[PDB]
Amino acid sequence: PGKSPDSPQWRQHQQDVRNLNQYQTRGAFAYISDQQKVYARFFWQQTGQDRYRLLLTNPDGSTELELNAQPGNVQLVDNKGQRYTADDAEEMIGKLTGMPIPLNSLRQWILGLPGDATDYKLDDQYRLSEITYSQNGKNWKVVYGGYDTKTQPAMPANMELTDGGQRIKLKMDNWIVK
Numbered sequence: 001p002g003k004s005p006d007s008p009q010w011r012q013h014q015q016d017v018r019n020l021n022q023y024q025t026r027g028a029f030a031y032i033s034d035q036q037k038v039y040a041r042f043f044w045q046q047t048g049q050d051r052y053r054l055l056l057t058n059p060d061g062s063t064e065l066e067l068n069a070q071p072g073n074v075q076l077v078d079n080k081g082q083r084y085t086a087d088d089a090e091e092m093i094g095k096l097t098g099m100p101i102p103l104n105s106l107r108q109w110i111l112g113l114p115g116d117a118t119d120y121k122l123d124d125q126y127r128l129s130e131i132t133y134s135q136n137g138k139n140w141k142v143v144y145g146g147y148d149t150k151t152q153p154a155m156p157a158n159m160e161l162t163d164g165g166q167r168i169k170l171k172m173d174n175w176i177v178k
Contacts, residue, residue, distance in 0.1 A: 002122050002129055009126035016110050016153035022047050024176040025110075025155070029056060030169035035098055040064050044168070046107065069095070099166070102135050110170070111143050112156050127154065138163050151175045 003010065010036025022045075029042040039059075043166070046052035050072075056065040066077035067089065075085040076092055086092050090103035108115035112128045123129040123144075131142035155177065159170040 002124060003122070003126045005122060006023075007126065010122055013126055013153060014113060017113055017155075020111075020153075020177050022176075023155075025112060025166070025172045025174070027157075027170060027172035031099060032167040032169075033099075034166065038064075044110065052107065065097075098162075100138065101168070102133075102138065102140060105133060105135060105140075109161075110156060110159065112144075112147075112153070125154075128156070136169040145171075148172060148175050151177055153177075 024045045025042070026043045028039075031038040040056040043055040043057075044052070048071075050069060052069050054065070054067040055063070058064045062079075063077060064079050066075075068075040069089055071079045072087075073085070074087060074089045074092060075083055076089070076096060076098065077083050084092065084096055091116075092156040093103055094100035105115050105117075108130065109128075114120045114128055114131055117131045117133045119132040120128065121130040125147075127144075127147055129144050131140070133140045133142070141162050143160045143162075144156055145160070148157040152170065155172070155175045157172045157175075159168075161168040
């Protein structure tokens with residue numbers, strides 16, 4: 001079934017998450033595709049609508065990918081050590097790895113927020129459960145597994161995006177929000 005989006009509950013959850021200033025999660029990443037299949041331990045952290053830090057490390061614990069972002073500026077480090085700093089991150093990302101990801105929408109979806117999507121669903125607990133988003137050509141389909149209910153508000157703990165041609169998995173061990 002799942003509860004309806006038009007409700008004080010679903011609206012409060014959004015307020016609860018939007019009312020946060022700092023986020024911090026870590027888990028297992030997994031980028032499937034025809035061209036490649038990367039795996040990594042990821043560390044996500046956001047301190048504002050712009051001031052987040054993403055980090056992917058190899059199995060031996062080496063920097064597979066590092067992305068720092070402040071308002072206006074955006075740095076990116078590869079598995080080698082080449083900083084390709086510039087402006088746009090959602091582009092600067094895919095371009096520099098062949099992973100055409102909707103980073104901007106994603107930093108909203110990873111928090112249980114739907115962003116612009118208007119085609120989504122909730123679960124029995126008025127929590128984001130699914131999304132069907134059409135981004136400039138690409139048609140993603142975000143699915144949410146169990147939630148981390150040990151935080152207030154509760155944050156996502158298992159996500160699975162799919163663009164037909166690509167596929168991203170994420171499983172969060174825990175969260176720290178403020």
